[PDB]
Amino acid sequence: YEPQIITTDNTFVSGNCDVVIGIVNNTVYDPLQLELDSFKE
Amino acid sequence: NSIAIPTNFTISVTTEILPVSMTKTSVDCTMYICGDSTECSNLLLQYGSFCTQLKRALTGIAVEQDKNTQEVFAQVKQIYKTPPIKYFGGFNFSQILPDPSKPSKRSPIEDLLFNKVTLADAGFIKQYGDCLGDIAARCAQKFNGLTVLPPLLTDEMIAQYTSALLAGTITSGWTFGAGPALQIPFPMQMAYRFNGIGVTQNVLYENQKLIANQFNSAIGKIQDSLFSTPSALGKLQDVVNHNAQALNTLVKQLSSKFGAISSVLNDILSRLDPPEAEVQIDRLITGRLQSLQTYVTQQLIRAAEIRASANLAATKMSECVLGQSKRVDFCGKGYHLMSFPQSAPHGVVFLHVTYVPAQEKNFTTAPAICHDGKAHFPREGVFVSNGTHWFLTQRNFYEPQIITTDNTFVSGNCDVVIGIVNNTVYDPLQLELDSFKE
Amino acid sequence: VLPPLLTDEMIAQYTSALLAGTITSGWTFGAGPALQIPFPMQMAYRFNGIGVTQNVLYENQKLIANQFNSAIGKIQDSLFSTPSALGKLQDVVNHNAQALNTLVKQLSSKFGAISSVLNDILSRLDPPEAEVQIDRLITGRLQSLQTYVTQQLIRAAEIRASANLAATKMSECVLGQSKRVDFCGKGYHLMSFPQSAPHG
Amino acid sequence: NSIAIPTNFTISVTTEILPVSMTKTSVDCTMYICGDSTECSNLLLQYGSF
Amino acid sequence: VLYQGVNCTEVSVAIHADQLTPTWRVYSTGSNVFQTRAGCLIGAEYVNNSYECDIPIGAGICASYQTQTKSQSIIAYTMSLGAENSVAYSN
Ligand SMILES: *[C@@H]1O[C@H](CO)[C@@H](O[C@@H]2O[C@H](CO)[C@@H](O[C@@H]3O[C@H](CO)[C@@H](O)[C@H](O)[C@@H]3O)[C@H](O)[C@H]2NC(C)=O)[C@H](O)[C@H]1NC(C)=O
Ligand SMILES: *[C@@H]1O[C@H](CO)[C@@H](O[C@@H]2O[C@H](CO)[C@@H](O[C@@H]3O[C@H](CO)[C@@H](O)[C@H](O)[C@@H]3O)[C@H](O)[C@H]2NC(C)=O)[C@H](O)[C@H]1NC(C)=O
Ligand SMILES: *[C@@H]1O[C@H](CO)[C@@H](O[C@@H]2O[C@H](CO)[C@@H](O)[C@H](O)[C@H]2NC(C)=O)[C@H](O)[C@H]1NC(C)=O
Ligand SMILES: *[C@@H]1O[C@H](CO)[C@@H](O[C@@H]2O[C@H](CO)[C@@H](O)[C@H](O)[C@H]2NC(C)=O)[C@H](O)[C@H]1NC(C)=O
Ligand SMILES: *[C@@H]1O[C@H](CO)[C@@H](O[C@@H]2O[C@H](CO)[C@@H](O)[C@H](O)[C@H]2NC(C)=O)[C@H](O)[C@H]1NC(C)=O
Ligand SMILES: *[C@@H]1O[C@H](CO)[C@@H](O)[C@H](O)[C@H]1NC(C)=O
Ligand SMILES: *[C@@H]1O[C@H](CO)[C@@H](O)[C@H](O)[C@H]1NC(C)=O
Ligand SMILES: *[C@@H]1O[C@H](CO)[C@@H](O)[C@H](O)[C@H]1NC(C)=O
Ligand SMILES: *[C@@H]1O[C@H](CO)[C@@H](O)[C@H](O)[C@H]1NC(C)=O
Ligand SMILES: *[C@@H]1O[C@H](CO)[C@@H](O)[C@H](O)[C@H]1NC(C)=O
């Protein structure tokens, strides 16, 4: 056990959310977008 | 430049039948050679430690057969049970899990496996049969000194070990084999088993219902195949038949004369005075020792063969049931995913659950993609083309994806790779960088 | 002596099928339908499997092909040069030949009898003694057959263990890429090729 | 803090030789023991199923 | 003493008739004679409590030397296979 933040580097994307049984809603933190908003401001 | 890649898959369940134990026999040396005859026994003493050796050999065999059964089945330190809900993502295990409504708590498949195999030795308190009918011949019927010892573990205890192994595998995957059992939803156990064979977990989730239905169909097919085919349980019936044949021959040898005036020891003692009876008895003793030594030699050889089989069965249970083996064809044909044990008389049946690629299509391929003078190689999978566009796909299931910096790595100039094909490699980050300010 | 069920031509056909399958389709040959793959990409996969990045093969593809071809030539020369290279199979043949020659040789032994020939015993002696002398020859010859069969059962068990090992190695080394150290030769395993040999 | 890393490699081919089968034999006990001798065969009959 | 393959009733009859070839006799009391599938076991008290197997007898029955009540004696029991473990499986 070693919890990490769920990000777009730790996960991969395949398909929509309707087909997977038991899918849950959560935030996935993209590094690039965050840096974009820190760089901009 | 052509590669074939499966666009579909089949869930295949196969059976493997292995002997684990041999019928445990015991021979009363004095009863067989010199039954209720003091003079014959006294003559037998002149041959030394004959009986003292066969008894050890047969005891060693009997102990070895109980050791073989424990090595194959006593691989778990706790008895695991399934939850009362028994819902596992749509995977139906009712044909392999214990049926509570029947005595002995055997699964339907185990019940068929036990009903199909005919046991000639039928170890029990044989005096219960008594008489009142023609003798069964089950093969001395005890009376000639040949008896059968029961196993240490009863069929119910073996079924309980099988149930514990099944509950552990179903509810915790391989974490129970290595250490404490850790609960996991069955579909995630399947997702990790998909990863074991090089197939991304998402393949399971989009096709979870298809996979569960193919699994249930395969289990039903196994149930029907085992029921329908008479000579399905060949190896176990062959072991039973060889032991029965050995005992039938050993008992039938008592009727031989070996040069004596009569095969019946009481007739020799009745007809002749000691000095002639001793010669006729010595002839019968010599023949009886030859018969017993031959029987024991073959039983030792068969015991070694059964030991090798039991060791293979234990290895398979450890590597196929308590984990996901990567050995090709060790745990059935196809890519090994998992297995389920079932008890059978004198042996074990493994149900091996594997995938068979299906509906392959052949695409054009390339060792690498050349972009701005750099050779791009896939991190995982291979490059394919449908004739107009290049994609990166996982090797064991067709799933095209756009070729990107994150999917590939760069090593060297395009000039070194013999088969490199010119194509665009898309560059994430740069695209959005532009959009940000431009 | 009974012939094998599969003749040398059928064994050669199985070996050829195994070679064509492995060369054309790699590790898929034994799992499901054969899937063609270019051989350099099969080797690239195998290199990635041992832990060497697939770019090593492509950058050094000609060197690797030359080393492979040289190694195969060296194998043929090694088998040609060394008389003992195939000793295991010659030993199996010699042991069966020795066992059969031993059984035939035992027919000339007296085993305590006055003569090794049954017709001489019957001609020269009266029935009463002749039955004893014949019983001695029968005892000796029956012991010779029992010894032969026991030795053949032991040898058969040894051959069965060897055959099971060979089948396991073919299924794990030829139909796939094994990670078992020293199971499929010394070094990091890439692949294997079967060849038929008499009795092995 | 010292590690050795290979900078080159060799492709090696080795041979492993395994027996698979042995010569299949069959024995006629009467001819072997009793070479067409009727008296020998009749005596042999008293040894049963050997 | 285990009388392999013999019914305990036959053993008791043979003992009362002094027909058994061995001349020694095992002390017989109520609950000291237990019928197993392997045979008749005389000289061990059968208990309901299941334990790990120590001295195997057969057909699930194993004997051991254990303290009862206050007093160590030989007992016979049905083998325990192991501790139970219910896995908290859920979706
Ligand atoms: C898991 O699978 C088992 C079978 O492998 C399912 O039990 C089966 O349930 C169906 C329900 O319709 C039974 O059908 C019945 O068949 C009899 C045949 O005479 C018929 O008369 C009835 O009207 C009905 O059509 C089927 O027999 C039964 N099979 C067994 C062996 O019990 C079970 O329901 C499945 N569980 C889940 C959760 O999917
Ligand atoms: C890694 O090792 C391999 C050998 O295992 C090296 O390849 C070998 O390189 C030598 C040159 O140093 C080659 O020798 C030359 O062969 C030609 C043949 O015509 C000859 O004309 C030259 O005079 C010289 O003798 C050798 O053949 C070659 N081996 C093979 C199989 O091609 C390789 O260079 C090594 N790489 C590194 C980075 O160390
Ligand atoms: C997970 O989040 C999605 C998106 O917010 C949810 O989908 C919405 O569900 C509401 C009702 O619950 C609808 O009115 C919206 O139109 C849906 N939008 C989309 C894009 O699907 C989904 O229901 C959430 N699931 C759970 C279990 O909370
Ligand atoms: C190869 O695959 C690409 C990607 O799907 C195909 O191009 C797409 O085709 C769909 C229709 O199936 C269109 O909706 C997309 O807009 C197309 N995208 C592009 C970039 O062309 C292409 O047609 C396929 N070619 C063959 C021969 O199968
Ligand atoms: C891939 O693209 C490169 C660059 O666009 C091509 O390189 C040219 O190759 C031709 C011969 O086919 C030479 O005459 C040019 O001088 C090369 N130019 C450069 C900048 O390298 C390469 O040929 C292309 N390969 C394929 C297969 O189309
Ligand atoms: C794969 O095959 C199954 C039948 O075995 C079929 O139901 C399914 O639709 C197929 N999937 C695709 C993508 O062709
Ligand atoms: C022993 O004999 C009695 C005789 O009444 C019988 O009832 C009992 O079932 C027998 N038990 C066994 C194990 O043979
Ligand atoms: C695909 O395989 C079939 C097999 O007969 C062959 O005829 C066809 O030409 C192949 N196509 C490609 C693009 O390799
Ligand atoms: C075990 O418990 C049952 C409960 O009904 C009892 O009848 C039986 O005699 C007990 N056995 C022993 C050996 O105490
Ligand atoms: C798992 O999902 C099924 C869906 O039918 C449901 O019936 C079952 O109760 C769920 N399990 C738990 C523990 O809630």
Numbering used by the authors:
A (entry chain A): 1110 to 1150
B (entry chain B): 710 to 847, 851 to 1150
C (entry chain C): 860 to 1059
D (entry chain C): 710 to 759
E (entry chain A): 610 to 679, 689 to 709
What did the study's authors say about this model?
The JN.1-sublineage KP.3.1.1 recently emerged as the globally prevalent SARS-CoV-2 variant, demonstrating increased infectivity and antibody escape. We investigate how mutations and a deletion in the KP.3.1.1 spike protein (S) affect hACE2 binding and antibody escape. To investigate the effects of N30 glycosylation introduced by S31Δ and two RBD mutations (F456L and Q493E) on the structure and function of the spike protein, we determined the cryo-EM structures of the recent SARS-CoV-2 variants KP.3.1.1 and JN.1.11 along with engineered variants JN.1.11 + S31Δ+Q493E, JN.1.11.1 + S31Δ, and JN.1.11 + S31Δ. The spike proteins exhibited three conformational states: “one RBD up,” “all RBD down,” and “flexible” (i.e., one or two RBDs disordered in the density maps due to flexibility).
In addition, to dissect how the mutations S31Δ, F456L, and Q493E affect the overall spike stability, we introduced these mutations into the JN.1.11 spike protein. Additionally, we also determined apo spike protein structures of engineered JN.1-derived mutants carrying S31Δ, F456L, and Q493E. Our results demonstrated that S31Δ indeed induces a fully glycan-occupied N30 glycosylation site in all of the variants carrying the S31 deletion, including JN.1.11 + S31Δ, JN.1.11.1 + S31Δ, JN.1.11 + Q493E + S31Δ, and KP.3.1.1. Similarly, JN.1.11 + S31Δ, JN.1.11.1 + S31Δ, and JN.1.11 + Q493E + S31Δ also shared similar NTD structures with KP.3.1.1. Using 3D variability analysis, we quantified the particle proportion for each conformational state and found that S31Δ did not affect the proportions of “one RBD up” and “all RBD down” particles by comparing the proportion of JN.1.11 and other spike proteins that have S31Δ. The data from three paired variant sets (JN.1.11 & JN.1.11 + S31Δ, JN.1.11.1 & JN.1.11.1 + S31Δ, and JN.1.11 + Q493E & JN.1.11 + Q493E + S31Δ) showed that S31Δ has little impact on hACE2 binding, which is consistent with previous studies. Besides, while F456L alone did not affect hACE2 binding (JN.1.11.1 has F456L compared to JN.1.11), Q493E alone substantially reduced binding affinity, which is also consistent with prior research and is likely due to the electrostatic repulsion between hACE2-E35 and RBD-E49317. RBD-Q493E alone in the presence of F456 would likely be disfavored due to an electrostatic repulsion with hACE2-E35. Q493E alone reduced hACE2 binding, while F456L by itself had minimal impact on the binding; however, hACE2 binding with the Q493E mutation was recovered in the context of F456L (JN.1.11 + S31Δ+Q493E vs. KP.3.1.1). In addition, other spike mutants with Q493E retain BD55-1205 binding, while F456L resulted in a binding affinity decrease where the only mutation of JN.1.11.1 is F456L compared to JN.1.11.
